[PDB]
Amino acid sequence: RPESELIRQSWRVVSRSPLEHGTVLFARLFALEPSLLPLFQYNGRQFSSPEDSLSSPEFLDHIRKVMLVIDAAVTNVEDLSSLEEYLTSLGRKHRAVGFRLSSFSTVGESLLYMLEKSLGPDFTPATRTAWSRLYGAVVQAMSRGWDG
Ligand code: HEM
């Protein structure tokens, strides 16, 4: 559609600087859901405060991964069936880390925030709506790693 392009166009801006943008996504996410923070367990140490996470290179790496999955979702915005099977298994990985199912919606409100703050006025409600459809779909796929 033209929604696919709303997405492509918004993303444009964000993949200039994906860590920086994802840094935003995650800080927002911890602000909204602090109980997520212990789920990263690099060396079986638990970050004590959000800012600790920002000093973890493993964590920053997880940001890069997040943004690359999202990036794959944008590339395939036309048909997200092509990455259903990947995303399903990726949801399974997340099941295993202790991630609740409810927590996806936060991750999604985090991404939106991040887009909204990056695009300011360009972040029109058709844009909120498109991303939300995209991310909604990513989660649908991901949720099938809780299958039942
Ligand atoms: C936001 C809450 C999330 C938490 C708390 C979380 C946590 C984790 C943890 C602990 C791992 C394992 C360690 C690591 O690879 O660095 C992991 C792996 C991964 N996460 Fe997340 N994650 C979250 C969301 C996401 C989201 C939304 C995505 C993608 C859109 C994502 C993509 C990945 C990827 C790609 C891996 C590597 C998976 C593999 O083994 O293939 N994560 N995540």
UniProtKB/Swiss-Prot annotation:
Pfam families: Globin. Induction: Up-regulated upon oxygen-glucose deprivation. Residues 1-147 form the Globin domain. Its EC number is 1.7.-.-. Coiled coil: none annotated. One of its GO terms (molecular function) is GDP-dissociation inhibitor activity. Keywords: Cytoplasm, Disulfide bond, Heme, Iron, Metal-binding, Mitochondrion, Oxidoreductase, Phosphoprotein. PROSITE patterns: GLOBIN. Its main location: cytoplasm. It comes from the Eukaryota. InterPro entries: Globin, Globin-like_OT, Globin-like_sf, Globin/Proto. Phosphorylated during hypoxia by ERK1/ERK2. Phosphorylation regulates the heme pocket hexacoordination preventing the association of His-62 with the heme metal center. Thereby, promotes the access of dioxygen and nitrite to the heme and stimulates the nitrite reductase activity. Phosphorylation during hypoxia is stabilized by 14-3-3 proteins. Gene3D superfamilies: Globins. It is found in: Cytoplasm, Cytosol; Mitochondrion matrix. It catalyses: Fe(III)-heme b-[protein] + nitric oxide + H2O = Fe(II)-heme b-[protein] + nitrite + 2 H(+). Belongs to the globin family. Monomeric globin with a bis-histidyl six-coordinate heme-iron atom through which it can bind dioxygen, carbon monoxide and nitric oxide. Could help transport oxygen and increase its availability to the metabolically active neuronal tissues, though its low quantity in tissues as well as its high affinity for dioxygen, which may limit its oxygen-releasing ability, argue against it. The ferrous/deoxygenated form exhibits a nitrite reductase activity and it could produce nitric oxide which in turn inhibits cellular respiration in response to hypoxia. Monomer. Homodimer and homotetramer; disulfide-linked. Mainly monomeric but also detected as part of homodimers and homotetramers. Interacts with 14-3-3 proteins; regulates the phosphorylation of NGB. Could interact (ferrous form) with G-alpha(i) proteins (GTP-bound form). This is Neuroglobin. It comes from Mus musculus. The gene is Ngb.
